[PDB]
């Protein structure tokens, strides 16, 4: 991409916490319901627009299961920031957070790190916000988030943008709506376009 400003962002946390789902939610808008464990690492770009210009996160979506991969200490090299995801429904994933922090910072001294307690949409948190003290140290930050309900879902990125850019008033701004190219469809197969549009109209919308 053309934005001159980019960051390497590694995303870590126990398997099943919703890391890949979160990245995807930012990526397409979709909410993947299913659980498919990330194999090792998936690298996905996320561009945001701001009052100071476009910025891009190169997100390294690492798998949290221990078992998939090899050199994750190697994935972490030259990373300029990170998110640690845990699941507020599952305390083990929060208790393991300290190893994620240790493991990241010994490969990268000064990186701004966010802790995210995903899945706050779920009715009974076993790990409340007020039990979150990990951020205490400077260059740390916590947010309750939910990839299901979008709750605080822009915030980890806003905060990191603010940190890495050096502007505490930095704001995400509207993505410019470029003119959509003067290229329409082919009506010869417009005969075909209807039934799949029916398949659509024959399919109830979830909820």
């Amino acid at each position: 991409g053309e934005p001159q400003v980019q960051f390497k962002l590694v995303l870590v946390g126990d398997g099943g916490t919703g890391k890949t789902t979160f990245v995807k939610r930012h990526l397409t808008g979709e909410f993947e319901k299913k659980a498919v464990a990330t194999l090792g690492v998936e690298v996905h770009p996320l561009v945001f627009h701001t009052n100071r210009g476009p910025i891009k996160f190169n997100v390294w979506d690492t798998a949290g299961q221990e078992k998939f991969g090899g050199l994750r200490d190697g994935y972490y090299i030259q990373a300029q920031c990170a998110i640690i995801m845990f699941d507020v429904t599952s305390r083990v994933t929060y208790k393991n957070v300290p190893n994620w922090h240790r493991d990241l910072v010994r490969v990268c001294e000064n990186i701004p790190i966010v802790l995210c307690g995903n899945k706050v949409d779920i009715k009974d948190r076993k790990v409340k916000a007020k039990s979150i003290v990990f951020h205490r140290k400077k260059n740390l930050q916590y947010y309750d988030i939910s990839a299901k309900s979008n709750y605080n879902f822009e915030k980890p990125f806003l905060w990191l943008a603010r940190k890495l850019i050096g502007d505490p008033n930095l704001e995400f701004v509207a993505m410019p709506a470029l003119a959509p190219p003067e290229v329409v469809m082919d009506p010869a197969l417009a005969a075909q376009y209807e039934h799949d549009l029916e398949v659509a109209q024959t399919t109830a919308l979830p909820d």
Binding site: G29, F172, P176, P180, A200
Partner: protein, 134 residues
């Protein structure tokens, strides 16, 4: 060791300053998944119907809340048909060459509103936009 210049503010240019609003309302947008044969969510946020003041072309534009990325961007065509979903008077489906991802991609899209009044207003304005595109 090199340090770096706090880049300059650029003026926020939305791309809509050459257009006029026909319609503005929050809504939920869905995209039909061809492979799985299921609806997939595309975004929630403000839908707009816009007419260019010079070309007179009218398009549909939609922005996702919080991140403010575009999740729908395509010219409205007279050939388009707004077709409610099931028995729902809160939602409609249509075909479109969408440019949200900055690429002209065919999609079947569903849009759902909070009140049936908002949906009726969306239909009404949509069809009204095509009323000048015949």
């Amino acid at each position: 060791e090199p340090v770096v210049p706090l880049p300059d503010k650029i003026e926020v240019k939305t791309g809509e300053e050459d257009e006029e609003e026909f319609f503005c309302n929050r809504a939920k947008l869905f995209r039909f998944d061809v492979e799985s044969k299921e609806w997939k969510e595309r975004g929630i946020g403000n839908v707009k119907i816009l007419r260019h003041k010079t070309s007179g072309k009218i398009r549909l534009l939609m922005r996702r809340e919080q991140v403010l990325k575009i999740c729908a961007n395509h010219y409205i065509s007279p050939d388009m048909k707004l077709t409610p979903n099931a028995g729902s008077d809160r939602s409609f489906v249509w075909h479109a060459l969408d440019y949200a991802d900055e690429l002209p991609k065919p999609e079947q899209l569903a849009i759902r509103f909070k009140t049936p009044e908002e949906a009726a207003l969306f239909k009404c304005k949509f069809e009204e936009a095509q009323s000048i595109l015949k």
